[PDB]
Structure formats: structure tokens, C-alpha cells
């Protein structure tokens, strides 16, 4: 195989040599030279994602290594993974590019932030006061709904075999 061999707290019985997971994947082994138990843990892997604005706007990019701690690879650690190339800002804005776990990225340089849910409003509730509208706005809004698709027919014999 291929993996890190860390120290193990698992007490093997004397007849056992390997160890397996719930899903029947090896998670432990006994060294045949010295009778010690090691926790086989596979080496780190991650989904490299590239966070970029439009090429019309800028050519700066940020890289998210999904699931990878920052010590195993403008470097910030998120629950989604390690984000390199974006600077964490304590301000909260609306989500522009979603990163995950409440983190979003935007271009202003590329910044990473905890997204704001909404503007804070406190309703002036009291037991004897009401708010009555004195005017109105006629609002027209758009709702776009798909209805049909492209009707496709495939000649199975011609597609697979041709002439």
C-alpha cells in the first residue's frame, strides 16, 4: 500500500497481524520485526478548486485544497479546507463565490469572509403599539420557469454501428 504509519493505541491479540475498518479497509498493522502496532493512515489528498472572478475583471486566483489541513500542503484554514491566495477579512458581506462552512470569497485582491445572512432589524414590539401602512408600492417581479426541453431521437443501430 501507501500511507503514513502513526503510533497506535489499539491492543492487538497475539495471533492477529493486520487490522480492518468497518468498511473492510486496512487501518492497522503489526510490524513483523518488532511486535508493535501501527495505525496505517493514507496520505493526504484533496480536491484542488480554483476561485476566480471573471477574466474580464481580473486574472488573480485563489486555490482551495478541500479537506487538506494547511500544514500538509495569504494562507487561511477553513473547515472546507486550506485556502491559499485570499486574505481573511473580519467584515461580513453577501456571498459572491461560495467556499463552504459559512465562508465566501469575493474580489474587491481576493478576500475571504464569513457571509452575512442579512441586515439586522429589530422590530419595535410592544403590547399596545401597531404599525399601519400609509402608502403602497406596486411591484412587478419576474419568475422564470423552464417548461420543455429539446426533443431528441437517437438511431440506436446507426449510432452504435453505422453502416
Amino acid at each position: 500500500g501507501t500511507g503514513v504509519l502513526t503510533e497506535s493505541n489499539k491492543k492487538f491479540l497475539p495471533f492477529q497481524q493486520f487490522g480492518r475498518d468497518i468498511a473492510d479497509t486496512t487501518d492497522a498493522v503489526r510490524d513483523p520485526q518488532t511486535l508493535e502496532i501501527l495505525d496505517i493512515t493514507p496520505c493526504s489528498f484533496g480536491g484542488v478548486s480554483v476561485i476566480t472572478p471573471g477574466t474580464n475583471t481580473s486574472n488573480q486566483v485563489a486555490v482551495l485544497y478541500q479537506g487538506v489541513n494547511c500544514t500538509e500542503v495569504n494562507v487561511f484554514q477553513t473547515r472546507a479546507g486550506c485556502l491559499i491566495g485570499a486574505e481573511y477579512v473580519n467584515n461580513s458581506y453577501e456571498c459572491d463565490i461560495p467556499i463552504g462552512a459559512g465562508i465566501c470569497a469575493s474580489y474587491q485582491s481576493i478576500i475571504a469572509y464569513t457571509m452575512s445572512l442579512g441586515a439586522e432589524n429589530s422590530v419595535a414590539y410592544s403590547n399596545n403599539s401597531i404599525a399601519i401602512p400609509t402608502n403602497f408600492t406596486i411591484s412587478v417581479t419576474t419568475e422564470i420557469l423552464p417548461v420543455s426541453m429539446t426533443k431528441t431521437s437517437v438511431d440506436c443501430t446507426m449510432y452504435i454501428c453505422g453502416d
Binding site: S129, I130, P133, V140, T142, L145, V154
Partner: protein, 204 residues
């Protein structure tokens, strides 16, 4: 704005392109061209190579049909939703909240779009709200008066009854209030006069 409909178009062409791209896959065979396989091998091994191409292409076609069926189900659900919006928002006024736009729905207009429909929802949005002091009931002559259709409001010194969704203060009379019980049960009842229309009539 029109990202959803274009997305459907984008998926369909891409699916056909992927299926077209699958014709250029060897699938574990010597060549991806059937004519070359026939022109190059004897039928005992050409049958094996054609079998590999057939199973790969058949798997690709079945995969394409499966995603087409899933997308057909999604588009059918969207079309059923669009028909429901056309029936309830365009052909009538809907009391369902947020079904036919944000706000109190007034009416809707259908517009055709490529592979889709665009609904223009005309809604009523309240604005310019004002604070008032409110009471559940008015105590007059030992009787509790409740609004027939409105709400009791006070601007600081005087009490009026107005409709809930627009500020239109009117004098509290017996015409727009109804009497149920005395003043001892309702929590928050306030003391105010209730005008009688017949009183000037018999007085004069």
C-alpha cells in the same frame, strides 16, 4: 436573468456532445473506427473488437438516456409548477404567500420564452408605515366594542378605526363596530366614546 432556461439548453447540447464524444473512445479496443476493425482483422477477433466497441457505446447511450429521463422528470415537475402558476396567478388572484411574487398578489402576466415561461407578478407592497397606539376593544356604556373589519388606532389623543393594510382613520361608530360582552373580560380594553348615527336624527 435568464440563466435557468439557457442552463437547460446548455445541458442538452452538452449531453449530445458527450454522446458524440463517446464515439471517439476505443473502450479497450485496437481502434475506435469500425471500418478499420473490419478492414484489418479476421472475423474471430474482429467480433471481439466490435463487441468491445458495442458494449462501450451501448453503455454510453444508456447513460445518456438515463440522464435524459432524470432531466425529463425535473422539467416535468417545473412544467407542472408553471401550469399551476398560470392557473392560480394569471387566471385568478392567489392568497398563497410567495406563490405569485413577493408581496400581496394582485395579478400576473404570462410571457413566452425559449423553452419556458416568464411570469410578471404584479403585487401590492405596503410602504411608509406609521406607529399608532392600539387597543383590542373600546369600552362604551359598560359594553365592549370590537371592529367589524378594521383595527383600533390612536394618534395620541383620539381613537379611530382603520383598515389593517392601509391607514384610513374613521370615527368609531356602531356601524363599524360590534358589541360582545361587557368591559370586564377583555384584557387591554380602553375607554372611548362610540358615536351613534341615529342620535342627531332623533335629536333634530
Amino acid at each position: 436573468a435568464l440563466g435557468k432556461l439557457q442552463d437547460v439548453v446548455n445541458h442538452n447540447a452538452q449531453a449530445l456532445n458527450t454522446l458524440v464524444k463517446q464515439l471517439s473512445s476505443k473502450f479497450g479496443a485496437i481502434s475506435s473506427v469500425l471500418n478499420d476493425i473490419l478492414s484489418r482483422l479476421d472475423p474471430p477477433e474482429a467480433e471481439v473488437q466490435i463487441d468491445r466497441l458495442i458494449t462501450g457505446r451501448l453503455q454510453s447511450l444508456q447513460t445518456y438516456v438515463t440522464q435524459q429521463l432524470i432531466r425529463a422528470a425535473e422539467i416535468r415537475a417545473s412544467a407542472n409548477l408553471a401550469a399551476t402558476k398560470m392557473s392560480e396567478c394569471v387566471l385568478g388572484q392567489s392568497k398563497r404567500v410567495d406563490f405569485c411574487g413577493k408581496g400581496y398578489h394582485l395579478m400576473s402576466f404570462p410571457q413566452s420564452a425559449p423553452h419556458g415561461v416568464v411570469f410578471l407578478h404584479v403585487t401590492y407592497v405596503p410602504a411608509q408605515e406609521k406607529n399608532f397606539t392600539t387597543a383590542p376593544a373600546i369600552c362604551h356604556d359598560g359594553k365592549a366594542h370590537f371592529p367589524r373589519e378594521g383595527v383600533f388606532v390612536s394618534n395620541g389623543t383620539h381613537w379611530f378605526v382603520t383598515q389593517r393594510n392601509f391607514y384610513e382613520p374613521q370615527i368609531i361608530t356602531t356601524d363599524n363596530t360590534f358589541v360582545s360582552g361587557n368591559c370586564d373580560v377583555v384584557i387591554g380594553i380602553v375607554n372611548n366614546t362610540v358615536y351613534d348615527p341615529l342620535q342627531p336624527e332623533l335629536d333634530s
